Ligand binder design. Structure first.
Ligand SMILES: [Zn+2]
Lengths: 48, 275, 132, 273, 274, 132
């Protein structure tokens, strides 16, 4: 119900919360951990 | 960082490691706190000394027992830095000062994790039934103003403290409690007071508040629902002060046994901080 | 030799094989800090390597038993075999060369690293027990 | 389970390093900088504490994290020692006449102390081991001592007239007194301006980091003659200007913090001390 | 193959090759730096000469040893044009000049790489624990102003140097250190000073600062955490200056052996630099 | 056993023998400095001992990978057998005790001596490959 440009900027605020939490960053990490281990190659974080 | 995250595998070896009072007689210190009136009534220049020889009987080596003089429940409540391993504090029922006494008991008998508060720059809130604001000093006068989720007053103007709600008028020790989960602009008289944000917890394995007089019903909780009665909360029937001390001496071990000073030490009295 | 023992086992009787430097100890290389603190500047405990037919174990006390009763620190290392060994010819020597040099080791919780800078003394009151 | 010391933490070499460690201290811990007045006076800015704070964000410490405490002398600073923050790094300006004042103050911060109160009036005391010392401090601390033989009689003194006592401290602000172990002594402190307490030493401090400005140093902080301990929480900087000192302290905050950390009593660990 | 590409394989032939000092006696030069007061106390017109004959004993051919006179730690700390293969500098303990001495030691005892800085047009920043600003001259007075990520002051107005932070008031040699990774508008007195941006590299396989007097120090670490004590940092107990020199001569090889070949200058280089 | 194999070979067929602690590695004790300078005060490289049936190899980095990518220094040791070994039972252990103590070593050119003062850390990302 209700929502005065609420659920709207809200469905957007619900967003403006997402990109700033668990699921967010984490996914943002794996992503890099690939780039940074594919681009890297030569000096690719040993890990193992 | 040795501690837990392991399990102590019980097993009922059932071996009994006799006595326990023989280690405390040798290795611990006993600090007796009393009010001035107590000593004044005794009227001897050697009472501390006489009692000390009497303390050898109960098993405490000469240099073991110390005698600290608070002259009031209000000052003792501010300066309570507990000096010895075992502290047994004598309190004389003063009926007008009951809450002063309650607030002081709540501090010694317990444990208290506190951080400094800057009343000037920030809007604070207590979190759980264990987050309380313990303030103490010359004259502690605390006025409060609850904030709605906008930083706006509720029954007050965050701008004029004449609209605040007074919850303490010049006390020497105060444990303030506000509706949990609500921000408040605070107005303490920081000139004579210090207010700190404390988290509670571990009862005290030392102080044994021994109460002289009345008929006592001690309600030391902030809520209405609970009433805790601990062993470190004893009571003696008033006759004369010399008698009180004789009893304290005649039953030192019994009183000490109701504490047990292993969790003690700490490194100074009261507060804490972990700022 | 092998079939010889294969039979004797069918008839349910006393078997037995012969081994040079047997492989009875699963690889295990670790330590146990009996006294430690965050800075790891005054530790006491043991570290070892059990592997194959060999055991090396060292007991260390950063304080050199300064506050220990009789200025002596006791150590102990127990190894439980998964199978009984009989007729064993064993070499026992003092000192654990493997744990006689400077090391930087991971803490028990893996959160940091400690420094081990050994100086070796002869093991006192050595007692080896082979139990069954 | 609280104190029952589990006899071991495993010793298996899993070998997994839990990376960083500075990223937990940046988030969760407080840094308290102690300096002398002269230090700040030479800086002459109303916003130096502020400027340095923004500079501290660089090294990774959130705005409300760092605090600046002003001792105006080594004597005062060594008289009420109430270390306020998680990590304390204290700056000391080399004053050659105050060396022992400084030594006694270092001995207190750099170490972990346990004390009890002493009643000089009623009970003549004695120290037990190389770790039992008498730490007294206040306005003006003047301590005279009188060794007792096994009869409660003086040895080179009359337990009756303090004019025969042996003076071992004349008006200091911090004093760690040491007497021949295992001997009783009638003590005569000036309790009016002094407080003397019986302390047992030990645990060191996983915090301070006394950073010394000037001289040449080597620091002998033991009461004996035999030992000389040099710890990581005892650093030294070459004096140029005070602004430079602070820049360096900031430019190497983590390095300085890494040389400290934890503090036995500042964790869950207490069911102890 | 010059390209400072490297490989070498350490088979233990164990041919322990003999002497080492008999190549240095023949092929190298020794330069002794002392303060004026040192020579004045000696009061001879032939001291440089007498010591030279004495130097033949220790094995240094006549034309081999040179004697350079700095009259102060501040001037000596200036152009630093170490003249010979081996330089052993004598420093007399002046307690007020300690940092002057520290800054000078830090320069000789170490290998420096510098570039020029234009304080006028570009506000700079240091990068690592090895990027320092070494300025030196008549009178070096450096005031600094830290910039936030906008080119705006932090506790200062990039416009009025009266709000800057003074970090050096008229020194003859100064190694300035600022919070790493922060831009700064600099205000040096370029008239009498020169400030250059240096990156610390190798150490020096030459100098051998020999310290007279005190009980001693001179720490060359800018941080608080480290304290490095090298072989090229020796100390002698003061009696008289003639004695100091006698000892320096009586132990020339011992002192030289604690230094040796100035590796950054060795012919055999290339991509590494000279 | 021996004649048994003498025949099988004379007929041009697949031979084979048995050895406890075979002697496949010619004695070789040396080092390789991957980073060095005249003073030998900041070296990086490896040193080893190949002899008989054993190999010990240590990788050292005086700088403790302070300026290395990911603060990790890679090492590698390759040993080429003169004959193929099959069916090998091998013990692999971390650490090279032989190179865990202070040494004064001759320089590669034999002109001087360098100082090695090791402190041991666990080898990271150990990978052993047996190639054919
Ligand atoms: Zn064998």
């Amino acid at each position: 119900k209700s929502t005065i440009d609420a659920a709207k900027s809200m469905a957007t605020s619900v967003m403006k919360k997402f990109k700033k939490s668990g699921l967010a960053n984490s996914v943002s990490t794996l992503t890099d951990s690939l780039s940074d281990a594919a681009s890297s190659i030569s000096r690719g974080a040993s890990i193992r | 960082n040795y501690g837990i995250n392991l399990p102590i595998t019980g097993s009922m070896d059932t071996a009994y490691a006799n006595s326990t009072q023989e280690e405390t007689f040798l290795t611990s210190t006993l600090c007796l706190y009393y009010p001035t009136e107590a000593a004044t009534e005794i009227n001897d220049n050697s009472w501390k000394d006489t009692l000390s020889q009497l303390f050898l009987t109960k098993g405490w080596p000469t240099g073991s027992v110390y005698f600290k003089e608070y002259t009031d429940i209000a000052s003792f409540s501010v300066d309570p830095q507990l000096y010895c391993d075992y502290n047994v504090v004598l309190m004389k029922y003063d009926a007008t000062l009951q809450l002063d006494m309650s607030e002081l008991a709540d501090l010694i008998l317990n444990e208290w994790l506190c951080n400094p508060m800057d009343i000037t720059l920030y809007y604070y809130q207590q979190t759980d039934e264990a987050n309380k604001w313990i303030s103490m000093g010359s004259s502690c006068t605390i006025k409060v103003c609850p904030l709605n989720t906008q930083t706006l007053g509720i029954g007050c103007l965050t701008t004029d403290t004449a609209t605040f709600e007074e919850v303490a008028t010049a006390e020497k020790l105060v444990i303030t409690d506000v509706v949990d989960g609500v921000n408040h602009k605070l107005d303490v008289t920081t000139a004579t007071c210090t207010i700190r944000n404390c988290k509670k917890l571990g009862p005290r394995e030392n102080v044994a508040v021994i109460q002289v007089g009345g008929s006592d019903v001690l309600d030391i909780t902030a809520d209405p629902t609970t009433a805790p009665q601990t062993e470190r909360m004893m009571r003696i029937n008033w006759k004369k002060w010399w008698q009180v001390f004789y009893t304290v001496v005649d039953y030192v071990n019994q009183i000490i046994q109701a504490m047990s000073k292993r969790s003690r030490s700490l490194n100074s009295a009261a507060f804490y901080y972990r700022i | 030799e092998y079939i010889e023992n294969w039979n004797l086992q069918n008839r349910r009787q006393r078997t037995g094989f012969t081994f040079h430097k047997p492989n009875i100890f699963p690889y295990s290389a670790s330590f146990t800090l009996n006294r430690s603190q965050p800075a790891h500047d005054n530790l006491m405990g043991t570290m070892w390597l059990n592997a194959g037919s060999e055991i090396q174990v060292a007991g260390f006390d950063y304080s050199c038993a300064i506050n220990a009763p009789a200025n002596i620190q006791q150590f102990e290392h127990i190894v439980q075999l998964r199978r009984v060994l009989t007729t064993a010819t064993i070499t026992l020597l003092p000192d654990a060369e493997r744990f006689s040099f400077p090391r930087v080791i991971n803490s028990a919780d893996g959160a940091t690293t400690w420094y081990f800078n050994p100086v070796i003394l002869r093991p006192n009151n050595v007692e080896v027990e082979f139990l069954l």
